[PDB]
Design a protein around this ligand. Structure first.
Ligand SMILES: *[C@@H]1O[C@H](CO)[C@@H](O[C@@H]2O[C@H](CO)[C@@H](O[C@@H]3O[C@H](CO[C@H]4O[C@H](CO[C@H]5O[C@H](CO)[C@@H](O)[C@H](O)[C@@H]5O)[C@@H](O)[C@H](O)[C@@H]4O[C@H]4O[C@H](CO)[C@@H](O)[C@H](O)[C@@H]4O)[C@@H](O)[C@H](O[C@H]4O[C@H](CO)[C@@H](O)[C@H](O)[C@@H]4O)[C@@H]3O)[C@H](O)[C@H]2NC(C)=O)[C@H](O)[C@H]1NC(C)=O
Ligand SMILES: *[C@@H]1O[C@H](CO)[C@@H](O[C@@H]2O[C@H](CO)[C@@H](O[C@@H]3O[C@H](CO[C@H]4O[C@H](CO)[C@@H](O)[C@H](O)[C@@H]4O)[C@@H](O)[C@H](O[C@H]4O[C@H](CO)[C@@H](O)[C@H](O)[C@@H]4O)[C@@H]3O)[C@H](O)[C@H]2NC(C)=O)[C@H](O)[C@H]1NC(C)=O
Ligand SMILES: *[C@@H]1O[C@H](CO)[C@@H](O[C@@H]2O[C@H](CO)[C@@H](O)[C@H](O)[C@H]2NC(C)=O)[C@H](O)[C@H]1NC(C)=O
Ligand SMILES: *[C@@H]1O[C@H](CO)[C@@H](O[C@@H]2O[C@H](CO)[C@@H](O)[C@H](O)[C@H]2NC(C)=O)[C@H](O)[C@H]1NC(C)=O
Ligand SMILES: *[C@@H]1O[C@H](CO)[C@@H](O[C@@H]2O[C@H](CO)[C@@H](O)[C@H](O)[C@H]2NC(C)=O)[C@H](O)[C@H]1NC(C)=O
Ligand code: NAG
Ligand code: NAG
Ligand code: NAG
Ligand code: NAG
Ligand code: NAG
Ligand code: NAG
Ligand code: NAG
Ligand code: NAG
Ligand code: NAG
Ligand code: NAG
Ligand code: NAG
Lengths: 97, 119, 557, 119
């Protein structure tokens, strides 16, 4: 249904993370951050709208049936497992390290 | 403040049944769809189902049909996920979630603490 | 040059929600879905086709459905307010199975329950024998009524009947109800054939949870309406083309007895059954239903792939109101097992009936509320109902991997869907009588000519204005209508336009405000299109009108 | 639909009393006057009286004063006519009636099935 890529991102703090997610369906795509030991709190929804409490470093933008999550200036509280969801279907996840 | 409090840390052998409770607060339980998601480690996470507690209407994921049942109480605002015929592929952290805006359930802003199940 | 001209009474409206009032046809009908605050209606005195008006409807985001939910719940509670409370009935029941004088176990899911109950006098008790349904009792042999530990069960007054009657929801002063006449309209997006009505066609509060009974039919073909179909949570409302006849019955005499349980408080219960103990059931015509499912899968294949597999299945779970088809029939509440209907698999390329077992309940927690429940008194005699299935509430199983096959189940659990399937063609709009337009003067019924071009539609402003100024929430709505009228009249007064209706004033028109060289403004554009084009500029125009009138009044006086 | 359901098929001997029960439905019983009318064969119908079953006020025909009593059970929505000192001249069909409009008692649009009484 939807393929998330890459499986793993090796990134140092301060770099910009781009997490891609392709889908064959038209739906709002949300992005969830799973910090180890914590619930996967919502990062963005509708493909570009930030959830309350999320810093403005998280955004999305792309054209066509494809989404990209851009995470600038990664901090020590990031580097979790990121998931894309469209209409109940979840991407395999990208581990950010 | 919306909060979902789940009981968990349950270990089961293949073939046993399990029940995970989810107590909800901070919103009207009747008026908002609650979702059960199975975050299997190392595997694509799966959304097990949704439960509309007003009438208790439920929608289970097709791969789980016949093995997953969801129930609830509305006088103690609690949802229940019950699984039967557990196998080794059911090892996962199970979450109870609620959407940011109840009109759209899928964007899940409120998550429970997480209930690991080892099989 | 171009100058601002103020027009009062323009056929312009916004998607603003308000409180609609009840209207109904004019003794025994005043004890059925009535508060006596519903005014007598007229024989459709006004239905004005809005030629050349295209309007955007959203049946899932409107306050007519939410208003029906609130009003029907209030109407229900008022019907049950001056009625017997069954707190005296929340007693320990000594229940045995209904006996056949043989060894057969419980028949009809009935339990014969002996209890001690209060009488007209407080010092004495009356032992009562009542045939309760298994679904009305919980074992605690000793049993209790299912809702006594959670809610105050109120007995319906014996004179009150639950048969649905048409309820017309009418626009208050200053508002219009727009109706979509498009055939095959799926309840969302633009509607080409739009009309203005004072009231709806008459919406029957037909309580049902899986199949829609006694509703409207689609004009040409089955219409499958969902805000989004790929979203599982959003229920799928299917409006049928030709109804499916469902013959429901309670084949038990259910001899009704009554006792006094307090001063003026009569409790009605089933005393005996003279004949055999039989299961209530509904017969859905088999050939008609199979053709109906054929039409439904054809429409779903139009929504999905044309080569997919559509499987029907019984409801996946929930309370009895969701897992079965709940409805009123002759005063009894049937909960029919629809697994006999939703069980076929359709793979893209006889006068028999499908009998659905039905359980009967007396304690009805309708709308699944906290702290409230109703006890339906039993009806004397065998019950028969012939109902028209005019629609369905369906859900689709999620987690759809291997998407060549999709699974559909009956829905329910949200009564607003029954009203959406009736209110799919209606929306409430607020009249915005104040419009501005460029002119060079530099000094049909309600909403008729709304789709006409401006100028032509500016010669009917009095017809539009005449329809303004025409319990607590209704009076607040009346005060809001008055306040909006007075805000428009006060604003015209500030502009020096209060008595002119068409007010030419000394404010130049800015070419940035969609100039279009005037010929398009008056010969091509309508008042709705024009108001949409300058919806972000009317505040500036109004401010300039206030400034110009203040300067002219100070300079002249 | 207004309906008046009367008991009947009674036969009595001279000197006995008779009681006719008229159950009313389809209108507010309390707010509308009921009448009892004697329709004997051959001779002109004799109106026996009216009952206003809220206060219970009654009006008995002059020749029947002292012989006719009318009562009501306001909880059972039932009017009762009691006729005493029966004679052979009281053979008639007795009818329970209601006016067309409750503002005007004597437009008897609603008649009961009738109570034949032979004496
Ligand atoms: C259920 O609900 C869902 C969502 O709630 C509904 O989905 C929406 O469906 C409508 C129509 O069904 C969609 O509108 C169409 O969108 C088309 C694509 O829009 C996206 O992409 C374009 C740019 O794509 C171009 O380039 C691509 C190259 O890869 C190419 O493949 C593509 O064809 C285009 O050429 C963006 O401009 C646009 O913003 C949008 O962006 C997508 O991706 C971003 C990722 O960041 C995401 O944020 C967005 O949400 C979205 O996913 C578009 O081409 C199409 O245009 C049509 O009209 C123009 C008229 O000028 C015509 O020229 C053209 O040929 C087309 O006919 C139209 O705008 C809408 O995007 C869907 N939205 C979402 C959120 O999914 C769904 O329909 C509904 N289903 C039911 C049954 O009710
Ligand atoms: C979908 O729509 C259909 C059609 O409207 C509904 O089915 C009707 O349901 C009503 C209510 O259950 C039925 O009305 C009842 O009919 C009984 C039989 O009446 C016979 O005699 C009368 C004489 O005038 C005829 O008009 C009638 O056709 C029958 O020949 C009556 O005995 C009932 O009255 C009893 O109850 C009422 C209160 O409920 C009291 O006021 C009365 O005094 C009395 O105790 C009542 O009138 C109607 O007959 C049904 N018709 C058909 C064709 O089935 C479905 O119920 C509705 N679907 C849903 C889900 O609600
Ligand atoms: C329900 O139970 C009551 C008693 O528990 C039954 O009433 C008795 O029925 C028998 C039938 O032969 C009579 O002889 C008794 O005199 C009745 N007793 C009383 C106190 O009424 C009743 O018949 C049972 N009803 C059903 C349908 O099983
Ligand atoms: C009110 O009573 C019902 C029925 O006793 C309670 O719901 C559950 O019902 C099932 C029926 O099979 C029982 O097995 C459960 O044990 C009941 N649960 C409990 C907690 O008793 C319902 O919970 C009760 N309501 C309240 C507020 O206690
Ligand atoms: C409606 O009836 C169906 C049968 O038509 C019921 O389905 C059965 O449910 C039991 C539950 O234990 C299963 O063991 C059976 O195998 C099912 N039967 C079939 C034929 O599949 C269903 O539970 C009933 N539902 C309601 C709400 O009454
Ligand atoms: C009543 O019928 C039920 C059917 O399940 C049975 O289990 C129960 O034992 C029966 N009880 C009596 C008292 O006959
Ligand atoms: C009713 O009360 C009597 C005592 O007066 C008791 O013996 C009997 O068991 C009670 N019966 C029921 C059905 O509760
Ligand atoms: C609107 O009504 C006219 C009446 O002639 C009809 O021809 C037309 O098809 C209707 N429009 C739609 C969209 O159904
Ligand atoms: C069905 O609804 C969609 C939006 O959900 C709309 O674009 C489409 O035109 C509608 N179909 C018809 C036949 O009106
Ligand atoms: C049911 O459908 C038939 C179709 O001919 C129609 O005549 C009848 O009036 C409908 N009944 C109801 C209650 O909608
Ligand atoms: C709709 O119903 C009519 C009969 O009223 C029937 O002729 C027509 O074929 C039906 N529509 C479809 C799509 O089958
Ligand atoms: C139900 O019982 C009553 C008892 O008086 C009887 O008159 C009536 O005919 C019975 N009904 C049926 C359908 O047999
Ligand atoms: C329902 O009953 C009516 C008589 O009231 C009969 O004409 C009709 O054929 C029956 N319908 C079904 C589907 O059994
Ligand atoms: C009747 O239902 C069966 C379900 O398998 C289907 O194959 C058949 O085509 C249907 N017949 C019709 C709609 O005439
Ligand atoms: C709608 O547009 C047509 C275009 O020919 C025009 O003739 C008709 O008069 C317009 N309708 C109204 C109500 O002005
Ligand atoms: C017209 O709009 C422009 C926008 O820059 C503004 O500067 C100018 O003053 C406006 N003129 C009038 C008459 O409103």
């Amino acid at each position: 249904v939807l393929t998330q890529s890459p499986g793993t991102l090796s990134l140092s703090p301060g770099e910009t993370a781009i997490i891609s997610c392709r889908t064959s369906q038209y739906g709002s795509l949300a992005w969830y951050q799973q910090r180890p030991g914590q619930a996967p709190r919502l990062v963005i929804y509708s493909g570009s709208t930030r959830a309350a409490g999320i810093p403005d470093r998280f955004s999305g933008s792309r054209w066509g049936p494809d989404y990209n999550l851009t995470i600038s200036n990664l901090e020590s509280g990031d580097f979790g497992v990121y998931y894309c969801q469209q209409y109940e279907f979840f991407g395999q996840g990208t581990k950010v390290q | 403040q919306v909060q979902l409090v789940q009981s968990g840390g349950q270990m089961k052998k293949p073939g046993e049944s399990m029940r995970i409770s989810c107590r909800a607060s901070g919103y009207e339980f009747i008026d908002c769809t609650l979702n059960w998601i199975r975050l299997a480690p190392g595997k694509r996470p799966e959304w097990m189902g949704w439960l509309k507690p007003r009438g208790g209407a439920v929608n289970y994921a097709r791969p789980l049909q016949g093995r997953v049942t969801m129930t609830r109480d509305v006088y103690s605002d609690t949802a229940f996920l019950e699984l039967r015929s557990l196998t080794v592929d059911d090892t996962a952290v199970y979450f109870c979630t609620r959407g940011k805006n109840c009109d759209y359930n899928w964007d899940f802003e409120h998550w429970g603490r997480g209930t690991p199940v080892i099989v | 040059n171009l100058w601002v001209t103020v027009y009062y009474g323009v056929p312009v409206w916004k998607d603003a929600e308000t409180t609609l009032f009840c209207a109904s046809d004019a003794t025994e009908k005043h004890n059925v879905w009535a508060t006596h605050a519903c005014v007598p209606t007229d024989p459709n005195p006004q239905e004005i086709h809005l030629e050349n008006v295209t309007e955007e409807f959203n049946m899932w985001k409107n306050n007519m459905v939410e208003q029906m939910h609130e009003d029907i719940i209030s109407l229900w509670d008022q019907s049950l307010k001056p009625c017997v409370k069954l707190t005296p009935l929340c007693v320990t029941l000594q229940c045995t199975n209904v006996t056949n004088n043989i060894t057969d176990d419980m028949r009809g899911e009935l339990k014969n329950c002996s209890f001690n109950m209060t009488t007209e006098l407080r010092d004495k008790k009356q032992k009562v024998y009542s045939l309760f349904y298994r679904l009305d009792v919980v074992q605690i042999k000793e049993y209790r009524l299912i809702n006594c530990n959670t809610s105050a069960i109120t007995q319906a007054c014996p004179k009150v009947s639950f048969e649905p009657i048409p309820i017309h929801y009418c626009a208050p002063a200053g508002f219009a109800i727009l109706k979509c006449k498009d055939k095959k309209f799926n309840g969302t997006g633009p509607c080409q054939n739009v009309s203005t009505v004072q009231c709806t066609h008459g919406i029957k509060p037909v309580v049902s949870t899986q199949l829609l009974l006694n509703g409207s039919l689609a004009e040409e073909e089955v219409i499958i309406r969902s805000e989004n179909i790929t979203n599982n949570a959003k229920n799928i409302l299917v409006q049928l083309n030709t109804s499916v006849q469902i013959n429901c019955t309670r084949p038990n005499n259910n001899t009704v007895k009554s006792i006094r349980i307090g001063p003026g408080q009569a409790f009605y219960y089933t005393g005996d059954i003279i004949g055999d103990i039989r299961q209530a059931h509904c017969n859905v015509s088999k050939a008609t239903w199979n053709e109906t499912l054929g039409k439904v899968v054809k429409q779903l294949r139009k929504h999905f792939g044309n080569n997919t597999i559509i499987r029907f299945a019984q409801s996946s779970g929930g309370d009895l109101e969701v897992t079965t088809h709940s409805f009123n029939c002759g005063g009894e509440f049937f909960y029919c097992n629809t697994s006999g209907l939703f069980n076929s698999t359709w793979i893209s390329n006889s006068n028999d009936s499908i009998t659905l077992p039905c359980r009967i309940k007396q304690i009805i927690n309708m709308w699944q509320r906290i702290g409230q429940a109703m006890y339906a008194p039993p009806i004397q005699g065998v019950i028969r109902c012939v109902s028209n299935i005019t629609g369905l509430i369906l859900t689709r199983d999620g987690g759809s991997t291997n998407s060549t096959t999709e699974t559909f189940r009956p829905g329910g659990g949200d009564m607003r869907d029954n009203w959406r399937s009736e209110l799919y063609k209606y929306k409430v709009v607020k009249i915005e009588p104040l419009g501005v337009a460029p002119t060079r003067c530099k000094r049909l019924g309600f909403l008729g000519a709304a789709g006409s071009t401006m100028g032509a539609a500016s010669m009917t402003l009095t017809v539009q204005a005449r329809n303004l100024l025409s319990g607590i929430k209704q009076l607040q709505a009346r005060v809001l209508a008055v306040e909006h009228y007075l805000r428009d009249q006060q604003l015209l007064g500030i502009w020096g336009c209060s008595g002119k209706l068409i007010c030419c004033t000394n404010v130049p028109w800015n070419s940035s405000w969609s100039n279009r060289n005037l010929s398009e403004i008056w010969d091509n554009m309508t008042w709705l299109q024009w108001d949409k084009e300058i919806s972000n500029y009317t505040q500036i125009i109004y401010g300039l009108l206030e400034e110009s009138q203040n300067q002219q009044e100070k300079n002249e006086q």
